[PDB]
Design a protein around this nucleic acid. Structure first.
Ligand SMILES: OC[C@H]1O[C@@](CO)(O[C@H]2O[C@H](CO)[C@@H](O)[C@H](O)[C@H]2O)[C@@H](O)[C@@H]1O
Ligand SMILES: *P(=O)(O)OC[C@H]1O[C@@H](n2cc(C)c(=O)[nH]c2=O)C[C@@H]1N=[N+]=[N-]
Ligand SMILES: [Mg+2]
Ligand SMILES: [Mg+2]
Ligand SMILES: [Mg+2]
Ligand SMILES: [Mg+2]
Lengths: 416, 553
DNA sequence: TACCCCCCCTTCGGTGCTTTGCACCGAAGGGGGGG
């Protein structure tokens, strides 16, 4: 007998009309079974072609998990649904989460199926299960309850969620808890044993409400305190070739867009003649000071760079080769909030696409913990290549926005 | 006594009203067959007679069924279509014979008068109103409205298709050892049942269907192979396409080549090796559909090789979920690729071609990856899994390509098939500057207004050149300067440019280009032994870069 | 003088860095096929 929270799309926007993409046999089987079980329980219901909306669905296995998990690509619906910040439903973000020694990620999406969804909004959650070789036309369902993956569901569930966690919080007031979509981020400074213990307590605590008023048991362990930053570094040499100094000057001139006090006059002079790229040339006294001054400037942080909660986050990734990937997170060009590098991820030396998928997942996770937002990615990959393979490697319950770029590396800017 | 199919609530687009488009003049012969078809529908209940009170009219016309004696009523509903709510289409793809498993017993039957067996939404019926001239605009004529889904309405396929599935739903669930492929009204029914128990199940199916007002006329009830289905011929252990008619006309217009190329496309799914590049080139241009076009020498060579393929009769096999899928690709030159998908040698499930040329400058490796990607997706559509690939490319070649390329790229499990012409990289840029090779600092500039330009270089040994250029651009001259450096250097050369544009193109190791000049640079690069390209920012007074910048400005 | 789906090849205009040229991409219109 729970009353449904009304929900409206942003004025002047239609619902999502995104076509279902082809699914592998194992994925279609998982979805048919999952949707069958969900239909018996009233969680979804069958619909026809007169509902004009559609949102893609597929299935994933989380890290080290053997059980299929339904995933709806609600990105379109999420960007067409009223921002709940205006409503005041939106969750605040704790600056302390990133400072904790251990942060565990808990899947709690299952909870959301307990709460009815506003009748007038249900039509927007339409999805179509496809069939191998198109044996059947698509089978359309829509949601009756709060669906996993929709940004409205944690908003509307916040009330029940805060009430449920209230005891545990008061007992252990040092532990930070942040809710993002279908996930719970639980951070503490305890020793690992007592941390996992407290997570286990919280799990059983959630079951006690589950008994009274994909699975919960899984849990992933982050350590935000140890998250390194990868800055811009100039090479160190005793002998410089003409090639080296041309590279150094091109790099410094690019950097000058980030640190304005950087100068290349003294270094550029060393390049006056028409010399063989391979010629060794002694650095002039002026040039040595200029280089040293530039290392100093690069050592200090950029001026006037800070997080604006109203602006979107953007992430760029470069493929550096040998399993190394660099990234920058920013809101305004050349004002990077964070820079970093990944190496030796799953797929190194055999599968670029798996590596990039992991990179995107890693960066999104860092952005959620640090800012409570997911960035829009500029992916260094062809659209067709990405779209063909990425769902084979996706292990997260959210999906960030992305776009495709092709930027030949003319300066080895973020990696030497 | 049928249980009637529940209606589908259908609305018009907010604040729009029904169609009011008056009937265009109808030629005599049609008017008669039209009237008789109307009266039949009237007896059946398919169309209600009322017309005093409904202001709406939509034009009607009539065309014969395919290869049949009969006349079929079509309604021009595009106005209603614009005013009607959008629908989400449930027909996502087309069934393909190579996805079927082998069945002991098979039936193919069609539902008869599909749209007219499903009751339209009560309130929407009034908008389907139309008028037919009783006797060639002699007397007023009679107004009519549809009681079921009308042909010509954009919502008729989706609604019938979805209703058909809801009717079939319980029959499938309660006969889990039958397979039914529904495409609109066409049903394929296959079982590993004894033809007796099969004929029974079929008869059970027709009753259930007749029970919901869906007839299955005997005239459309195929019982003996070869089954005609979706434009194919299904035999018990092999399938094939229904005969392809190739126009042999000596005079070709634009439209003749379009039809021809289209038909070849359709044939490529089972006839290995079909090529359309030359024929398609003939099509490229502003030429209108009527203008006649002489076949290029190489264009009619293609057509001849095509004939040689369509001479033999090919057949595909069916799918055995227990055997791996195998895809094999061959390079056919000029950006053309064909493939075969199969599970046992020379028993192709199907074939196809990939020939899309995307990008001004590309190479064979990029094109092969694209072909792999198309084949992976086509395979997931028909079988729901990725085939093992057999490719004309050395393991070493792929490794060198994908590890050095700056975009993420990948190919799923594959092995080398030594079938020429092999895909390879035609040149490789050095990673480090070449000791003892001449360094060419190149630059090029054009005048935005004159479209006049210069390209040249200066060298660490004093060598220099400047060339005047006409009808050009900055970017062309930048490529030109690199061309000059390559033309005038030994087998090993260092080149320093400031053209982001030029370095972008060349660093992706293209082997073919839509630009003649890029092709010329590629040809030089292939002859070289070592080439090192290096970028420097312009206008920073570097090297000979500032010395060559003043030559050509 | 009609409707819905899929496919290939071409053209064409919108978009963004390679910038005021050039490259890319999606839409639409030609053809094939199904109902
Ligand atoms: O890979 C992008 C691709 O996905 C589509 C269809 O699924 O749109 C989805 O992805 C976009 C990129 O993030 C989202 O902006 C969009 O909301 C989501 O539906 C295609 O539109 C796009 O080509
Ligand atoms: P199948 O040939 O049996 O036709 C089934 C239904 O599809 C609709 N249709 C078919 C064709 C060929 C067309 O050009 N336009 C259509 O609307 C109508 C037909 N059902 N009925 N009556
Ligand atoms: Mg029929
Ligand atoms: Mg039919
Ligand atoms: Mg230049
Ligand atoms: Mg210049």
């Amino acid at each position: 007998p729970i009353e449904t929270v009304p929900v409206k799309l942003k004025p002047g926007m239609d619902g999502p009309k995104v076509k279902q993409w082809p699914l592998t046999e194992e994925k279609i089987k998982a979805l048919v079974e999952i949707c069958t079980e969900m239909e018996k329980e009233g969680k979804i219901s069958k619909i026809g072609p007169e509902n004009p909306y559609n949102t893609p669905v597929f299935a994933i296995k989380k890290k080290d998990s053997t059980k299929w998990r339904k995933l709806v690509d609600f990105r379109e619906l999420n960007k067409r649904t009223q921002d709940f910040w205006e409503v005041q439903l939106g969750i605040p973000h704790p600056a302390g989460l990133k400072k904790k020694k251990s942060v565990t990620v808990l899947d709690v999406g299952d909870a959301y199926f307990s709460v009815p969804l506003d009748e007038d909004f249900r039509k927007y959650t339409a999805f179509t299960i496809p069939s191998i070789n198109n044996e059947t036309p698509g089978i359309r369902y829509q949601y009756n309850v709060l669906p996993q993956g929709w940004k409205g569901s944690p908003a509307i569930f916040q009330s029940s969620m805060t009430k449920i966690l209230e005891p545990f919080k008061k007992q252990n007031p040092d532990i930070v808890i942040y809710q993002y979509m279908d996930d719970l981020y639980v951070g503490s400074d305890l020793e690992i044993g007592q941390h996992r213990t407290k997570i286990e307590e919280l799990r059983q605590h959630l079951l006690r409400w589950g008994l009274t008023t994909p699975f919960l048991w899984m849990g992933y362990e982050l350590h935000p305190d140890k998250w390194t930053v990868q800055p811009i570094v100039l090479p160190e040499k005793d002998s410089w070739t003409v090639n080296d100094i041309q590279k150094l000057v091109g790099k410094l001139n690019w950097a000058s867009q980030i640190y304005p006090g950087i100068k290349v006059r003294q270094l550029s002079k060393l390049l006056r003649g028409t010399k063989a790229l391979t010629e060794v040339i002694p650095l002039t006294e002026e040039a040595e000071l200029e280089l040293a001054e530039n290392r100093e400037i690069l050592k200090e942080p950029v001026h006037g760079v800070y997080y604006d909660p109203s602006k979107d986050l953007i992430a760029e990734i470069q493929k550096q080769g040998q399993g190394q990937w660099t990234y920058q997170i920013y809101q305004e060009p050349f004002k990077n909030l964070k820079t970093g590098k990944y190496a030796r991820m799953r797929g190194a030396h055999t599968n670029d696409v798996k590596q990039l998928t992991e990179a995107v997942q890693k960066i999104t996770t860092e952005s959620i913990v640090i800012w409570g937002k997911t960035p829009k990615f500029k992916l260094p990959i062809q659209k067709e290549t990405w779209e063909t393979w990425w769902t084979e490697y996706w292990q997260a319950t959210w999906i960030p926005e992305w776009e495709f770029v092709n930027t030949p590396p003319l300066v080895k800017l973020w990696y030497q | 006594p049928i249980s009637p199919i529940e209606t589908v609530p259908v609305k018009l687009k907010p604040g729009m009203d029904g169609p009011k488009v008056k009937q265009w003049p109808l030629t005599e012969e049609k008017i008669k067959a039209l009237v008789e078809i109307c009266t039949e529908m009237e007896k059946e209940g398919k169309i209600s007679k009322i017309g005093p009170e409904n202001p709406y009219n939509t034009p009607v016309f009539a065309i014969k069924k395919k290869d049949s004696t009969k006349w079929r009523k079509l309604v021009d509903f595009r106005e209603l279509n614009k005013r009607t709510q959008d629908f989400w289409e449930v027909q996502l793809g087309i069934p393909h014979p190579a996805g079927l498993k082998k069945k002991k017993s098979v039936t193919v039957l069609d539902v008869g008068d599909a749209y007219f067996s499903v009751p339209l939404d009560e309130d929407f019926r009034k908008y389907t109103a139309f008028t037919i001239p009783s006797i060639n605009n002699e007397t007023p004529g009679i107004r009519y409205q549809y009681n079921v889904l009308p042909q010509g309405w954009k919502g008729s396929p989706a609604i019938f298709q979805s209703s058909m599935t809801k009717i079939l739903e319980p029959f499938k669930k309660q006969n889990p050892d039958i397979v039914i492929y529904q495409y609109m009204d066409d049903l394929y029914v296959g079982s590993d049942l004894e033809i007796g128990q099969h004929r029974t199940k079929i008869e059970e199916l027709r009753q259930h269907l007749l029970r919901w007002g869906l007839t299955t006329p005997d005239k459309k009830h195929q019982k003996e192979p070869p089954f005609l289905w979706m434009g194919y011929e299904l035999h018990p252990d092999k399938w094939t396409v229904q005969p392809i008619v190739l126009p042999e006309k000596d005079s070709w217009t634009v439209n003749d080549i379009q039809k021809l190329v289209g038909k070849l496309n359709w044939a490529s799914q089972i006839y290995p090796g079909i090529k359309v590049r030359q024929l398609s080139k003939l099509l490229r241009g502003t030429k209108a559909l009527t203008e006649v076009i002489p076949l290029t020498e190489e264009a009619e060579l293609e057509l001849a090789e095509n004939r040689e393929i369509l001479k033999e009769p090919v057949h595909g096999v069916y799918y055995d979920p227990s055997k791996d899928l195998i895809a094999e690709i061959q390079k056919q030159g000029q950006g053309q690729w064909t493939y075969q998908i199969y599970q046992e040698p020379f028993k192709n499930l199907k074939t196809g071609k990939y020939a899309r040329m995307r990008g001004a400058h590309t190479n064979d490796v990029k094109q092969l990856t694209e072909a792999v990607q198309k084949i992976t997706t086509e395979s997931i559509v028909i079988w729901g899994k990725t085939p093992k690939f057999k490719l004309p490319i050395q393991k070493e070649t792929w490794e060198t390509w994908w590890t050095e390329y700056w975009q993420a790229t990948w190919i799923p499990e594959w092995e080398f098939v030594n079938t020429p012409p092999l895909v390879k990289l035609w040149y490789q840029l050095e990673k480090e500057p070449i000791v003892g090779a001449e360094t060419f600092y190149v630059d090029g500039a054009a005048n935005r207004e004159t479209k006049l330009g210069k390209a040249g270089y200066v060298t660490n040994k004093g060598r220099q050149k400047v060339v005047p250029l006409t009808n050009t651009t900055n970017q062309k001259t930048e490529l030109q300067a690199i061309y000059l450096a390559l033309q005038d250097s030994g087998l090993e050369v260092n080149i320093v440019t400031d053209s982001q544009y030029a370095l972008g193109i060349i660093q992706a190791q293209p082997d073919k280009s839509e630009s003649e000049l890029v092709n010329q640079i590629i040809e030089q690069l292939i002859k070289k032994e070592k080439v090192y390209l290096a970028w420097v920012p312009a206008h920073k007074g570097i090297g000979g870069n500032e010395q060559v910048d003043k030559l050509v400005s």
